[PDB]
Amino acid sequence: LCPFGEVFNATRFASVYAWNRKRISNCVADYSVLYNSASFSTFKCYGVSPTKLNDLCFTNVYADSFVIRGDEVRQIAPGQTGKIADYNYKLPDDFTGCVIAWNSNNLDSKVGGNYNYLYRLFRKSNLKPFERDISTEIYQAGSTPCNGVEGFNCYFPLQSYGFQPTNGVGYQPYRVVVLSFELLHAPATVCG
Amino acid sequence: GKKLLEAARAGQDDEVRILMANGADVNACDPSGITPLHLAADKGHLEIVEVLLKYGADVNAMDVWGRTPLHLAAFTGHLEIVEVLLKYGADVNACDLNGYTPLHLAAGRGHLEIVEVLLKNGAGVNAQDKFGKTAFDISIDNGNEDLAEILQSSS
């Protein structure tokens, strides 16, 4: 009784650095639609066996969704290091949720490249588990103030991608969604 | 590993030799990809520069930005480190993410002597950056009167 279509069959999506924070409750979720989706190939699901998660139903249905490059989809895994996992998006360890990723090159591709998506490169702090830290301030490598005007080593925050029609499948960006399920001390859970 | 990088920063010539005689990797780098040839060039430790290249230091090493130690030497204003790297076979046409050549870097800070050193090994006078500006175009903006003459003479 909740719109999983508008998060699955949508057309406007966020990026790695600004993944959408969504909370959904008070409905029923058709878990079986994934097993017969006929379009999912990377159902590397975690935390609970696909067959066990069917009957159970709880709160904290936190959902995440963004895009990622092709060959680096494996970096999305709890307790596993990676370029995004170490600098762009931490995964809360012991993650008792489930993830879905698939290839959708038919719509997220244009001639000449798609220079809209970006990702960060460096930071001072560390990626705490389940943290999104959007920022625009530029870090520094020297005491010289790069105050807005262009400079040598003032750590320009993000760099874009290129999604050309001739790009290979392995380099083609895959759409990824993330689901988590656990409980809070408050009783009377809401099923799905 | 970690010892060799910080030793290159501190300018410890003797500490360089003890660790390098231990079989340490000559092309080790930090998470940012900074090889210790970068550190020796940036800090201006001429003695460390000579020692590393003797046993096969990566003269074309690049960081996450693609920076070369020649770029650091050119921008800092180090005289004899630049030439010895060119003697070892340093590349001159490499462009970073911004596309700045080592010739461009000397133009910004007015390092006159570095300009001819790279030019003697074949530095491109008409090189473009990401903005399309040249080292000659750097001179007119920064008000360096003399530096524009050398590039124009070689134009």
Curated annotation (Swiss-Prot), chain A:
This is Spike protein S1. Disulfide bonds join 2-27, 45-98, 57-191, 146-154. Changing residue 37 to L: In strain: Omicron/BA.1. Changing residue 119 to F: In strain: B.1.1.298. Glycans are attached at residue 9. The gene is S. Attaches the virion to the cell membrane by interacting with host receptor, initiating the infection. The major receptor is host ACE2. When S2/S2' has been cleaved, binding to the receptor triggers direct fusion at the cell membrane. When S2/S2' has not been cleaved, binding to the receptor results in internalization of the virus by endocytosis using host TFRC and GRM2 and leading to fusion of the virion membrane with the host endosomal membrane. Alternatively, may use NRP1/NRP2 and integrin as entry receptors. Changing residue 156 to L: Increased resistance to neutralizing antibodies and human covalescent sera neutralization. Changing residue 159 to Y: Reduced host ACE2-binding affinity in vitro. It comes from Severe acute respiratory syndrome coronavirus 2 (2019-nCoV). Binds to host ACE2. RBD also interacts with the N-linked glycan on 'Asn-90' of ACE2. Cleavage of S generates a polybasic C-terminal sequence on S1 that binds to host Neuropilin-1 (NRP1) and Neuropilin-2 (NRP2) receptors. Interacts with host integrin alpha-5/beta-1 (ITGA5:ITGB1) and with ACE2 in complex with integrin alpha-5/beta-1 (ITGA5:ITGB1). May interact via cytoplasmic c-terminus with M protein. May interact (via N-terminus) with host bilirubin and biliverdin, thereby preventing antibody binding to the SARS-CoV-2 spike NTD via an allosteric mechanism. Changing residue 122 to L: In strain: Omicron/EG.5.1. Changing residue 111 to P: In strain: Omicron/XBB.1.5, Omicron/EG.5.1. Changing residue 34 to I: In strain: Omicron/XBB.1.5, Omicron/EG.5.1. Residues 1-192 form the BetaCoV S1-CTD domain.
